[PDB]
């Protein structure tokens, strides 16, 4: 057999040569002429030769996890976190194992998501003179929206911006008297502007609430407003806005229609929008030069940015916005109101549906030692090899188990080897200690 063919100088080599291979130090069975190679043999092949069982040495190891931490059942239920260290995303955190040649040790790893993904939201509000009546509803909605964000998740970013109309002779009266204010002398309306960014993304809610109140209404001559033009800048100006690798939500509220490409011909503008950030000092100074972006061109910019768009509008314009909602994918339509229940409900509904992917990273192992990962996922989904490490479509509170097997060919060192196994994007890791012995006990 292979054990006989092992030609082991000592007992330790036998174990190194094979798993079943056993060694007898009595030397009563082994022939004096025959080399210590004959002592090495199958456990059955030794017992058959009459070698004593106690004399025969067959060291093996038993799988035993040194530390075991139970996964949190709550799993941050209803966007509520007890503490960062208190939540556990891995059951077998630290484990200790002994690796013998031909004795692969397999453990079970269970991963449960006890956290909520961070969300970034940007608020865009129309300031035309016709929104003077609805101004109260828009201001109230902002504070309610921020309160929902705190309840929905621990970490969030909130920012807002405003738009009016193109600074052109046709759209806004060019008369010097109305240049200062288009509203009647009794009122004190501000000058018209294409896009004005009042606040960049920030983590403080209190600053966001106070800024919304100070906003003052502006007025233009035509019924439709340039809302599409304002969205283009926000989508492409990642630097100024402060966009990060986090789910992005855009809220747009208007009580008037939207101009589309080819509507700038009357003004005298014929250059199509290039979708390039032209914001200067947190303002848009090239509104006149570029024509309003088309729906087809506008959709492409949002898809590349992967920014979800939510529109809050009045009941009268609802029938028009619904047709647009059918066109743009991953978008929803809401009705602006004093109550503002529908606008808040859509955000919470959107947040509830989120699918993520969890992968497993393992530390380098010794030569002749390999590891196999067997993934288990929702709907009986089971991967193998590389596919068997990653799991996708996992919602919050969903737990998936993973079967890991470690096999040792030979023993590189006498001392144990500790390596850390943590999934990408998660601080929590899995430490596995592997001790291999080539000398018979």
């Amino acid at each position, epitope marked *: 057999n292979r054990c006989l063919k092992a030609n082991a100088k000592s007992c330790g080599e036998c174990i190194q040569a094979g798993p079943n291979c056993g060694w007898c130090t009595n030397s009563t069975f082994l022939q004096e002429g025959m080399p210590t190679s004959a002592r090495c043999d199958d456990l059955e092949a030794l017992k058959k030769k009459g070698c004593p069982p106690d004399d025969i040495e067959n060291p093996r190891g038993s799988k035993d996890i040194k530390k075991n931490k139970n996964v949190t059942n709550r799993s941050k239920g209803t966007a509520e976190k007890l503490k*960062p260290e208190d939540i556990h995303q891995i059951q077998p955190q630290q484990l200790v194992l002994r690796l013998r040649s031909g004795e692969p040790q397999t453990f079970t790893l269970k991963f449960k998501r006890a956290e909520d993904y961070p969300i970034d939201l940007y608020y865009l509000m129309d300031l035309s003179y016709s929104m003077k009546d609805d101004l109260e509803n828009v201001k109230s909605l902002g504070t309610d929206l921020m309160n929902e964000m705190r309840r929905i998740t621990s*970490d969030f970013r909130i920012g807002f911006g405003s738009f009016v109309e193109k600074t052109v002779m046709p759209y806004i009266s060019t008369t010097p008297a109305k240049l200062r204010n288009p509203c009647t002398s009794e009122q004190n309306c501000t000058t018209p502007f294409s896009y004005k960014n*009042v*606040l*960049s*993304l*920030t*983590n*403080k809610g*209190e*600053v966001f609430n*106070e*800024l919304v109140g100070k906003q003052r209404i502006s007025g233009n001559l035509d019924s439709p407003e340039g809302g599409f033009d304002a969205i283009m800048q926000v989508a492409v100006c990642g*630097s*100024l*806005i*402060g*966009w*990060r*690798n986090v789910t992005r939500l855009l809220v747009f509220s208007t009580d008037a229609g939207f101009h589309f490409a080819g509507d700038g011909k009357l003004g005298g503008i014929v250059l199509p929008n290039d979708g390039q950030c032209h914001l200067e000092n*947190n303002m848009y100074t090239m509104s006149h030069y570029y024509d309003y972006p088309s729906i087809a061109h506008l959709v492409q910019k949002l898809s590349e940015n992967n920014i979800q768009t939510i529109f809050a509008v009045t009941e009268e314009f609802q029938p028009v916005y619904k047709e647009l909602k059918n066109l743009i994918p991953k978008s929803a339509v809401g009705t602006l109101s004093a109550n503002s229940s529908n606008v808040i409900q859509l955000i919470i509904d959107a947040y509830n549906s989120l699918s993520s992917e969890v992968i497993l990273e393992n530390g380098k192992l010794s030569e002749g030692v390999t590891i196999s990962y067997k993934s288990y996922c929702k709907n009986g989904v089971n991967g193998t090899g590389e596919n068997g490490r990653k799991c996708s479509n996992i919602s919050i509170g969903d737990e998936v188990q993973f079967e890991i097997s470690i096999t040792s060919n030979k023993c590189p060192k006498k001392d144990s080897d500790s390596f850390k196994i943590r999934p990408l994007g998660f601080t929590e890791e899995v430490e596995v200690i592997l001790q291999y012995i080539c000398e018979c006990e």
Partner: antibody
Amino acid sequence: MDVKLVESGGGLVKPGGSLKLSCAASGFTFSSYTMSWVRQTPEKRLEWVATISSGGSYTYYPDSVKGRFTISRDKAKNTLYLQMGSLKSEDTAMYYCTRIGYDEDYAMDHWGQGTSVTVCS
Amino acid sequence: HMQIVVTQRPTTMAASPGDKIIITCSVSSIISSNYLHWYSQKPGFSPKLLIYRTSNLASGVPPRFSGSGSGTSYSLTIGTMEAEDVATYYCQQGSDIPLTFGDGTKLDLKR
């Protein structure tokens, strides 16, 4: 510029003592601009102790000194007050009175002379 | 409780007059350019805001000083080093609470 900030009342404090710091703002409307307290340590590092809004509706405090200090303002006297209680050895530093020119940028544009408060064992 | 971490690459350095000095600032998480600020402090004097919004020099600041960057990378560049330019420079980010100031670079005159 043309903004005068003066901090007075700094003194040696025993561990667990209470020290009150008063900041005077002149040449500008104190209520209109948000005010904050910044202290420089003996390693020449900068740590932000507190931030108070112009309205006075809300305030911001760091975790280390959070819940152990108090910040308030007096519109009538145009004076900023920092109340310190249960002071430790780490607390000794050079405290400065600041003024945030724009809330959106959240950048400090004015810095006071400052008063040194050193804990004594 | 997640806190932004500010890092300044040259903790201490010394250069001859007319030399070009470049100091960087690393942020742990993505922030907006307007939030980032730079502060310069002379010895025996209180800190003064040299540049605001990373692209604007505070009134009373010489033209040589310049700022540029985006995302998590920033830098303060001095075209010509001068005896007055000798001070401690700190890059502070006010995007999120708490507000954190990175260790100031003790740039001084060599020999």
